[PDB]
Amino acid sequence: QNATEIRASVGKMIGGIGRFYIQMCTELKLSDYEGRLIQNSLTIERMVLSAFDERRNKYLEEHPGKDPKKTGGPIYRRVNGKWMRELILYDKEEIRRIWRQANNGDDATAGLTHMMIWHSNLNDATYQRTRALVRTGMDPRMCSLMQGSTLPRRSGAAGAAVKGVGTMVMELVRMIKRGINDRNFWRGENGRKTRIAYERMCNILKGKFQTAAQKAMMDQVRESRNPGNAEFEDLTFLARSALILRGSVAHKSCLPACVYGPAVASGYDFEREGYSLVGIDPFRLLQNSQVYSLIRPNENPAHKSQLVWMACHSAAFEDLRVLSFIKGTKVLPRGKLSTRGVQIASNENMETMESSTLELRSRYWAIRTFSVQRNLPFDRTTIMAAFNGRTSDMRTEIIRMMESARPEDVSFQGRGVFELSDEKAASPIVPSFDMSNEGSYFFGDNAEEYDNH
Numbered sequence: 535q536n537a538t539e540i541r542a543s544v545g546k547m548i549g550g551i552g553r554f555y556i557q558m559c560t561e562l563k564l565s566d567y568e569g570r571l572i573q574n575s576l577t578i579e580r581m582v583l584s585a586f587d588e589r590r591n592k593y594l595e596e597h598p599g600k601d602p603k604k605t606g607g608p609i610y611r612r613v614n615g616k617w618m619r620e621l622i623l624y625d626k627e628e629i630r631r632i633w634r635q636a637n638n639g640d641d642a643t644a645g646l647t648h649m650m651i652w653h654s655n656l657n658d659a660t661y662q663r664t665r666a667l668v669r670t671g672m673d674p675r676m677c678s679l680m681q682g683s684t685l686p687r688r689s690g691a692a693g694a695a696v697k698g699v700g701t702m703v704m705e706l707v708r709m710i711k712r713g714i715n716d717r718n719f720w721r722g723e724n725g726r727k728t729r730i731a732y733e734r735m736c737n738i739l740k741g742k743f744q745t746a747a748q749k750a751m752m753d754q755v756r757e758s759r760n761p762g763n764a765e766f767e768d769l770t771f772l773a774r775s776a777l778i779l780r781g782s783v784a785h786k787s788c789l790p791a792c793v794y795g796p797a798v799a800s801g802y803d804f805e806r807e808g809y810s811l812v813g814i815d816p817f818r819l820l821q822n823s824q825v826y827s828l829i830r831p832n833e834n835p836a837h838k839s840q841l842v843w844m845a846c847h848s849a850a851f852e853d854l855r856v857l858s859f860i861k862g863t864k865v866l867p868r869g870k871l872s873t874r875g876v877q878i879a880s881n882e883n884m885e886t887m888e889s890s891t892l893e894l895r896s897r898y899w900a901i902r903t904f905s906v907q908r909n910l911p912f913d914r915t916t917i918m919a920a921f922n923g924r925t926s927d928m929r930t931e932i933i934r935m936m937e938s939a940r941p942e943d944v945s946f947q948g949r950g951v952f953e954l955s956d957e958k959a960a961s962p963i964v965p966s967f968d969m970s971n972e973g974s975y976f977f978g979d980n981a982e983e984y985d986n987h
């Protein structure tokens with residue numbers, strides 16, 4: 535009976551985001567089109583994360599905003615066939631009241647982390663993190679292990695699950711660099727809290743490893759009373775190892791509020807029907823949805839649609855050849871998309887801006903991981919980065935595992951793909967892949983580096 539109870543409590547969370555978005559569209563007097571504008575969804579999603587964040591950086595990152603009791607951003611309206619941008623300012627107390635009213639009195643912080651994860655996934659598909667890796671002394675080819683790297687600093691347990699091996703390594707390495715340059719970083723009251731933060735991140739990263747030797751190496755890193763070069767080296771060693779010996783990184787398909795809003799509006803009872811982020815529910819919901827996006831004059835709308843599709847399905851870090859078989863169209867690496875980002879900057883010219891319908895559908899659905907061996911080669915930059923390296927018996931054990939798994943390539947995991955009509959997953963399809971296609975989203979990447987406006 536517990537399986538249906540998880541579905542009901544997740545559905546209850548979804549339904550509250552839906553009712554909240556409907557009430558917000560209503561307050562703002564947004565049309566059906568404006569309500570389904572993904573830029574409007576972002577502003578409303580951020581408004582409620584900002585109303586509960588209270589400048590702690592738990593659900594959001596904002597530039598310091600003007601009046602602490604007020605929050606807002608850009609709402610876009612179609613006046614006389616043209617898109618206009620307006621800066622709204624809503625009372626944080628009032629936003630919190632609408633959020634709680636939408637969730638039948640409950641605080642529903644799971645609804646907030648759900649929207650925060652959606653933002654993180656959209657950032658993982660939009661902006662590059664290569665210069666950030668270089669600044670921490672890390673190999674920029676660790677770009678494929680950067681799940682949830684734009685998450686806000688105080689994102690708790692809900693953020694930890696979706697973070698990658700490289701994200702945890704980058705975070706822990708930044709602390710070790712501060713301790714190396716300044717011993718006072720591990721002293722006093724600040725040092726006591728940083729030590730507990732360090733031990734927490736170590737156990738979160740350790741939990742992500744799936745071998746005995748990698749977890750045992752994380753114990754050595756964690757027990758180190760004064761972290762220095764030897765801890766940085768082990769962490770980067772384990773990050774290189776995570777390119778072949780894949781870790782346990784939770785990938786959550788979190789949709790925008792302008793997807794949950796219309797489904798709730800049409801009477802879908804998410805609490806009663808149940809909802810699961812794993813499987814058909816997000817794919818089925820995107821088939822029954824209609825979302826729009828503001829687009830720039832030189833952007834391809836099929837490319838803007840792919841970026842949003844990848845963000846919806848938390849697919850930025852998946853093998854492109856796998857995503858192409860599931861979507862039914864060829865999914866291109868970020869360096870081949872002629873699009874620059876969903877969010878409209880304050881300095882952009884709205885007079886040239888147009889709108890387009892986002893293609894968020896998929897040929898097949900699939901589930902998060904007598905069979906036929908269906909292999910996919912490791913990408914060229916993955917093998918060079920993973921085999922870039924002082925000595926230990928756990929290091930030789932990890933090297934032995936990395937060298938024996940390497941010729942085996944990446945086998946597709948799970949029992950095939952499913953037609954959208956097959957809701958019970960009883961008729962799997964053979965997944966074919968054109969092994970000549972790149973396979974990594976970040977190959978030849980030219981996307982803007984992540985920055986807070």
Ligand SMILES: COC[C@@]1(C)COC[C@@H](COc2ccc(-c3cc(C(N)=O)c(=O)[nH]c3C(F)(F)F)cc2)O1
Binds near residue numbers: 816847852860910
């Ligand atoms: C480096 O990849 C490692 C391998 C080769 C290991 O074997 C598994 C294989 C790929 O498997 C899948 C990856 C992603 C999905 C999937 C699932 C959901 C979901 N709600 O459940 C979703 O929302 N979206 C997707 C999508 F494809 F779009 F990313 C299904 C299967 O990847």
